[PDB]
Design a protein around this ligand. Structure first.
Ligand SMILES: *[C@@H]1O[C@H](CO)[C@@H](O)[C@H](O)[C@H]1NC(C)=O
Ligand SMILES: *[C@@H]1O[C@H](CO)[C@@H](O)[C@H](O)[C@H]1NC(C)=O
Ligand SMILES: [Ca+2]
Ligand SMILES: [Cu+2]
Ligand SMILES: [Cu+2]
Ligand SMILES: [Cu+2]
Ligand SMILES: [Cu+2]
Ligand SMILES: [Cu+2]
Ligand SMILES: [Cu+2]
Ligand code: NA
Ligand SMILES: [O]
Length: 1029
């Protein structure tokens, strides 16, 4: 059908915590809220003016249609079913220009609502700048191409926002939800067997970026003269950590019944600090028929989830990013009894597993050997990167910290202690494994031999209010939420089918438990452990999975000892001058950020050993804050996850993953974090795979043979050869702005740096480089796109025409040795990459998948210096439509880490003498936020036709900062085998390699960008062109 909405943009005053109390939130004392909510002489408080979308009954925009209270400031909910034509009648009643741009629906250029250089004419531009008092009516068509995929639910979450300066428009308040549904799955604007629909935007809503900042300062700050917009504390006080714009618990309206079938539409929004971990303390959810609880959201991440509300009472919805939790990213919801009126599991007291766990103080050395196992270098080597963390002296703790750690004892006295064996040598700091099967009951007798009160909070199991490990509320014998320094308490959790693995899940799921009297300090103090929840009849009496040789539990995180309950205690036991230590000095706190796996650093983790051919399950999980974006890479072997083949697992606060691996080659390999600073900081370990059988000789499995001649060449690389697109963008936006990254001013470098890049040659003489033709113009900085099929042996003849050692190696591929030999300058070496079945698609991948190739001599610096490329591995050779391929690398090139920094100062700075490599402004000037090493629409060659199929190969690498939410204007993509899932933003992080299918249908020049604020603004964007057929 054809549907009409009337949406006005008005200016209005918005309250971020409309009272009314009195609350206790997790990890938030009753005074902390003042930071953000307290009006003052130099602080705005909790009221702000902003621009919001409202719904109207009528073309005479006078009577509003009120929204549900839980929506907050979000625009009104728009819905559509496949086949529907939606007309959005916008009227702008604010003081400045805005638009309506919608994410998951098809439109011509007249109806995109976004301004940018696309060669359009006046009649396709009226949509892109709706002036005050002006009115524009947008035509949207819900096509099949944009429909939810066969593997999605009936409805998916999409958004709409203003898109002049989207970041600032959205910060100002113009963001709302657009729910797209299959036909005929809707009945009277609600989905057919769903009782409740809620939408929840998680975001650090940043009023510093609003168009109304100055109006707000002028209005509320009783001393406007004394405000410094760039003072860091003032900025914090305007960062409103919110769900739907509600802070500190004040989200009202989230009420439901026991039994109710609920659909949640979640999204993230904002900047680099918007690393969220949405958590329903409830409460168990499914996403895509998989059990989850936690969901991670980033700027523009679109997600949906299904919940049969159960376990009646007052619950918390929160962000488990500990920095967020403690700034109040928390909303209550309630499940009331109405009464039942259903039934089900039932199982309580039948199969009982009984654990006895104590909390106790130890001195944990994060690196017992005292050396870095990968380099054999002494950790305190003056000048080394490890020295920052392991140096000990007048104002510096070192490698070893007093911690609190869970440990297992034999029975209900605490006389004895279950000694750890070989199977648990790798656990390290982690507490004992809690394991249960669906249908079991779990009792945990917890005893506290520490000096602070503690608890145990499990993720992934069922527990009533009497057993909850955290305390919170909307309005001393020990309890679930509080076991004090000498006391003891026995928790009861259940594991019913509705909280355990579904048919689509694997046999066991990775979960975790931690103390949560204050989880923002307890975890880092050391109170974290692994859990494993499995299907009925899948484990042995001893806890081991039936047909599985090995099971490992990995918890990588940044152990922020600055947040440890034992910090002061540690300062007084380890520094040789305790009084001179400033607990606020940046350098000091870096020295206490311990980047580690199971509390181990610099290759010192023991006990990851296994036989070749072994069946191995890896249980990964993490915790922490925004710094915790991890890409755990298993060199030398791949794994399956949800039928996808990968070798690098992405993890965020409270993320957990179950990986299946069959290691296929003898050696000692690395398990390490790809994320640049984590690696440098010591997040790297070995795992050994031994030979325990024969030993055949050769299985003659070379269906295919290829050879490629590639060189590293030093080249002058320009991140922005032209500036016309940028000038036009900023002109269209009316922005007085200038460019930190590209403007030389007095002495900065600019857009051109000497780099080293891979390039293809025609033969072994290396004297004729291969012509890059039209369909490879888009590669930019990337090395050539190499192809291989499963079955192939790929010879890489590699010449180093550069001036220091380098190599070339690919993710995914199998080689004979775990070490990669460096190629010296002038040398040519041969590397052989075998492509067995495990180097290619899993059963649920598309036919072609991408893997990064890169140099291993110094993985951080060689990368930032320019050496990176895509290897595409395809399945099995065995109609009219043209198939295209594009590889895209989303990476912030950090020129401060290039081997060529010094040269680039001497060559490109007008006054090199005045450069200080350690100055924060110079540092920023060399962080080049690029796509394939080009910015601001300087990446050409993304050109295609209506009717084509396009495989996009998205790749991510880099640092903590390198979260990238890749978004294509005008079109959606599908992914997975047979295009089963569907969306228009894909999350990309370091180590994330994904293939997306696109079937372009709408002619136009369309914007392609990362949706993270700082990244758009720094030019991480280009356009792609769709031509008529
Ligand atoms: C826009 O127009 C110019 C001038 O006609 C053309 O040469 C240029 O390639 C166009 N831009 C794109 C992205 O197609
Ligand atoms: C590292 O060097 C110091 C002296 O510079 C020495 O005392 C220490 O034992 C060394 N560590 C190891 C593990 O060899
Ligand atoms: Ca337009
Ligand atoms: Cu958007
Ligand atoms: Cu968050
Ligand atoms: Cu990491
Ligand atoms: Cu980005
Ligand atoms: Cu868009
Ligand atoms: Cu956009
Ligand atoms: Na404030
Ligand atoms: O979009």
């Amino acid at each position: 059908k054809e549907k009409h909405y009337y949406i006005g943009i008005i200016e209005t005053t918005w309250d971020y915590a409309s009272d009314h109390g009195e609350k206790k939130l997790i990890s938030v004392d009753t005074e902390h809220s003042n930071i953000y909510l307290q009006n003052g002489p130099d602080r705005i408080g909790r009221l702000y003016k902003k621009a919001l979308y409202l719904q109207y009954t009528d073309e005479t925009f006078r009577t509003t249609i009120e929204k549900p209270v839980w929506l907050g400031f979000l625009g009104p909910i728009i819905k559509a079913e496949t086949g529907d034509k939606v007309y959005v009648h916008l009227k702008n009643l604010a003081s400045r220009p805005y638009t309506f741009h919608s994410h998951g629906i098809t439109y011509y250029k007249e109806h995109e609502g976004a301004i940018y250089p696309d060669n359009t004419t006046d009649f396709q531009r009226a949509d892109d700048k709706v002036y005050p008092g002006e009115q524009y009516t947008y035509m949207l068509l819900a096509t099949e191409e944009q429909s939810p995929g066969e593997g999605d639910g009936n409805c998916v979450t999409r958004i709409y926002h203003s898109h002049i300066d989207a970041p600032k428009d959205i910060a100002s308040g113009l963001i709302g939800p657009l729910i797209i549904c299959k036909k005929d799955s809707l009945d009277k604007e609600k989905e057919k067997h769903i009782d409740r629909e809620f939408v929840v935007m998680f975001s650090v809503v940043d009023e510093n970026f609003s168009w109304y900042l100055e109006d707000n300062i002028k209005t509320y700050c009783s001393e406007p003269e004394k405000v410094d917009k760039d003072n860091e504390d003032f900025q914090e006080s305007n960062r409103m950590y919110s769900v739907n714009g509600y802070t500190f618990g004040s989200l009202p309206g989230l009420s439901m019944c026991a039994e109710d079938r609920v659909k949640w539409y979640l999204f993230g929004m904002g900047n680099e600090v918007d690393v969220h971990a949405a958590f329903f303390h409830g409460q168990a959810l499914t996403n895509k028929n998989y059990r989850i609880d936690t969901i991670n959201l980033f700027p523009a991440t679109l997600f949906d989830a299904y919940m049969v509300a159960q376990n009646p009472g007052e619950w918390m919805l929160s962000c488990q990013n500990l920095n967020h939790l403690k700034a109040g990213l928390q909303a209550f919801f309630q499940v009331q009894e109405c009464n039942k009126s259903s039934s089900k599991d039932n199982i309580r007291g039948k199969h009982v597993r009984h654990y006895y766990i104590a909390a106790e103080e130890i001195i944990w050395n994060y690196a017992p050997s005292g050396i870095d196992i990968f380099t054999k270098e002494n950790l305190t080597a003056p000048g080394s990167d490890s020295a920052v963390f392991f140096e000990q002296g007048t104002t510096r703790i070192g490698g070893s910290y007093k911690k609190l750690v869970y440990r297992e004892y034999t029975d209900a006295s605490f006389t004895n202690r279950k000694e750890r064996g070989p199977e648990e040598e790798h656990l390290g700091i982690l507490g004992p494994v809690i394991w249960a099967e669906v249908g079991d009951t779990i009792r945990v007798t917890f005893h506290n031999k520490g000096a602070y009160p503690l608890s145990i909070e499990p993720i992934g199991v069922r527990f009533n209010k009497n057993n909850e490990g955290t305390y919170y509320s909307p309005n001393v014998p020990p309890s679930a939420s509080h076991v004090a320094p000498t006391e003891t308490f026995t928790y009861e959790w259940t594991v019913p089918k509705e909280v355990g693995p579904t048919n689509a899940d694997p046999v066991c799921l990775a979960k975790m438990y931690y103390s949560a009297v204050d989880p923002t300090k307890d975890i880092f103090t050391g109170l974290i452990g692994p859990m494993k929840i499995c299907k009925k009849g899948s484990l042995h009496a001893n806890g081991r999975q039936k047909d599985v040789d090995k099971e490992f539990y990995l918890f990588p995180t940044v152990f922020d000892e600055n947040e440890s309950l034992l910090l002061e205690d540690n300062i007084r036991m380890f520094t040789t001058a305790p009084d001179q230590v400033d607990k606020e000095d940046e350098d000091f706190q870096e020295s206490n950020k311990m980047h580690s796996m199971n509390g181990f650093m610099y290759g010192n983790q023991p006990g990851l050993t296994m036989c070749k051919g072994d069946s191995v399950v890896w249980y990964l999980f993490s915790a922490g804050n925004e710094a915790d974006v991890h890409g755990i890479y298993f060199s030398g072997n791949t794994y399956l996850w949800r039928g996808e083949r990968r070798d690098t697992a992405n993890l965020f606060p409270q993320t957990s993953l179950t990986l299946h691996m069959w290691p296929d080659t003898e050696g000692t390999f690395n398990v390490e974090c790809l994320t640049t600073d984590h690696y440098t900081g010591g997040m790297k370990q070995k795992y050994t795979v031994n030979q325990c059988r024969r030993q055949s000789e050769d299985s003659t499995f070379y269906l295919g043979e290829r050879t490629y001649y590639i060189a590293a060449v030093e080249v002058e690389w320009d991140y922005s050869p032209q500036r016309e697109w940028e000038k036009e963008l900023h002109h269209l936006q009316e922005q007085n702005v200038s460019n930190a990254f590209l403007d030389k001013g007095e002495f900065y470098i600019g857009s051109k740096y000497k780099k080293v890049v891979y390039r293809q040659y025609t033969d072994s003489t290396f004297r004729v480089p291969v012509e890059r033709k039209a369909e490879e113009e888009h590669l930019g900085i990337l090395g050539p796109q190499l192809h291989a099929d499963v079955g192939d042996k790929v010879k890489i003849i590699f010449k180093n025409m550069a001036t220091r050692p380098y190599s070339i190696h690919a993710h995914g591929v199998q080689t004979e040795s775990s070490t990669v030999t460096p190629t010296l300058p002038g040398e040519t070496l041969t590397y052989v990459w075998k492509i067995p079945e495990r180097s290619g698609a899993g059963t649920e991948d598309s036919a072609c998948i991408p893997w990064a190739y890169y140099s291993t001599v110094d993985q951080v610096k060689d990368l930032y210096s320019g050496l990176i490329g895509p290897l595409i591995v395809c399945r099995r050779p065995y109609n009219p439509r043209r198939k295209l391929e594009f590889a895209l690398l989303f990476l912030v090139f950090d020129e401060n880490e290039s081997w060529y920094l010094d040269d680039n100062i001497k060559t490109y700075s007008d006054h090199p003498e005045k450069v200080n490599k350690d100055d924060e402004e110079f540092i920023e000037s060399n962080k080049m936020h690029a796509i394939n090493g080009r910015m601001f629409g300087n990446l050409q060659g993304l050109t295609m036709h209506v009717g084509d199929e396009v495989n996009w190969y998205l790749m991510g690498m880099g640092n903590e900062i390198d979260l990238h939410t890749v978004h294509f204007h005008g079109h959606s993509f599908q992914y997975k085998h047979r295009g089963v899932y569907s969306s228009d933003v894909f999350d990309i992080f370091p180590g994330t390699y994904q293939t997306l299918e696109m079937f372009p249908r709408t002619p136009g020049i369309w914007l392609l960008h990362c949706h993270v604020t700082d990244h758009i603004h720094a030019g991480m964007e280009t356009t792609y062109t769709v031509l008529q057929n």
